[PDB]
Design an enzyme around this catalytic site. Structure first.
Site, PDB file in Angstrom:
ATOM      1  N   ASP A  35       0.836  -1.193   0.000  1.00 59.53           N
ATOM      2  CA  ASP A  35       0.000   0.000   0.000  1.00 59.53           C
ATOM      3  C   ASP A  35       0.875   1.247   0.000  1.00 59.53           C
ATOM      4  OD1 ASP A  35      -1.901   1.936   0.312  1.00 59.53           O
ATOM      5  OD2 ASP A  35      -2.405   1.421   2.371  1.00 59.53           O
ATOM      6  N   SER A 199      -0.660  15.618 -11.975  1.00 60.43           N
ATOM      7  CA  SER A 199      -0.908  15.266 -13.360  1.00 60.43           C
ATOM      8  C   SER A 199      -1.159  16.528 -14.169  1.00 60.43           C
ATOM      9  CB  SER A 199      -2.129  14.345 -13.426  1.00 60.43           C
ATOM     10  OG  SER A 199      -2.529  14.071 -14.754  1.00 60.43           O
TER      11      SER A 199
END
Length: 330
Positions: A35, A199
């Site tokens: 994770d 992004s």
């Protein structure tokens, strides 16, 4: 040193991935959920409340000759999906894919929430976010990667998650045969303890690319892709019959639909998520309403590039002094 381990989807939807991890001496192999959005290595154990164990493999520290109680240490964690777990702490030898760390903090669960009990395939979590998020008190502990870093050939790990198939976590090296083209690296902020990056925009299907900054985290422990409501609305508007359902808890779509792809930007590069990766199947067995793999982050407080996004790429988690992320198509 290096390590390399195969990671395997737990079910036919790729809801999560499990990777075998050797703990203790002799080894006890548990299948952990790696994770990158958390920083605790915790396991079902011989100390876990018996009614809360239902098919998981447990770690028994009393059977490990290298286990040592970390005196006074406790841990307690709550995840973004509302699940939680807590317990005490041992140090022990932990190996992943041939890479060994001695003295790793292994957090033994005394209690786990129902969602963990109900998932017999996941024996615990191995956190790969920054150690500043580790919950051990009163002395915070380091992640497996943090402990291994100095010994690794290069201070990196890579995630190569499969679509409906196994993939690979590598430590200490970048397998140049595992991706196509080049890896585009992008800046990371560690201020929140995550692999947080920006992004450069998105496209829906064959549509034009929208240049817009989307800050979010690379999180292998989250199944879906959670993005701003504007972006998610633009995606689902291209699927006839798709709608946000308050009762179901997100966007649903007719199972008869063919889904468009979704592209996200990494610098000037582009990662394309095929439409099929966005299908999470019937909302309940036999339903013709299917659950979408792109959902709004509006209620989270952060955008999350979970498995839906990451499995479309070869992803480099570069733990150099100034960390960065790399993405390549594959």
């Amino acid at each position: 040193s290096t390590g390399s381990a195969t990671t395997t989807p737990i079910d036919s939807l790729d809801d999560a991935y499990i990777t075998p991890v050797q703990i203790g001496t002799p080894a006890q192999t548990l299948n952990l959920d790696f994770d990158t959005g958390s920083s605790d290595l915790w396991v079902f154990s011989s100390e876990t409340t018996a009614s809360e164990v239902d098919g998981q493999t447990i770690y028994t520290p009393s059977k490990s000759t290298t286990a040592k109680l970390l005196s006074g240490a406790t841990w307690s964690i709550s995840y973004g999906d509302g699940s939680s777990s807590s317990g005490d702490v041992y140090t022990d030898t932990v190996s992943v894919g041939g890479l060994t760390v001695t003295g790793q903090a292994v957090e033994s669960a005394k209690k786990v929430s129902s969602s963990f009990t109900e998932d017999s395939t996941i024996d615990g979590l191995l956190g790969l976010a920054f150690s500043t998020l580790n919950t051990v008190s009163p002395t915070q502990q380091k992640t497996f990667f943090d402990n291994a870093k100095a010994s690794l050939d290069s201070p990196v790990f890579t995630a190569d998650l499969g679509y409906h198939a196994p993939g690979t976590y590598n430590f200490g090296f970048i397998d140049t045969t595992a991706y196509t083209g080049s890896i585009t690296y992008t800046a990371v902020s560690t201020k929140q303890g995550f692999w947080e990056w920006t992004s450069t925009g998105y496209a829906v299907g064959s549509g034009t690319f929208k240049s817009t900054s989307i800050d979010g985290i690379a999180d292998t422990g989250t199944t879906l892709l959670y993005l701003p409501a504007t972006v998610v609305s633009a995606y689902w508007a291209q699927v006839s019959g798709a709608k946000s359902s308050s009762s179901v808890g997100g966007y649903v779509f007719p199972c008869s639909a063919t889904l468009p792809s979704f592209t996200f930007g990494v610098g000037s590069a582009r990662i394309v998520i095929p439409g099929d990766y966005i299908d999470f199947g019937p909302i309940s067995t036999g339903s013709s309403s299917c659950f979408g793999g792109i959902q709004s982050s509006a209620g989270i407080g952060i955008n999350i590039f979970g498995d839906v996004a990451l499995k479309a790429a070869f992803v480099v988690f570069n733990g150099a002094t100034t960390p960065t992320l790399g993405f390549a198509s594959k």
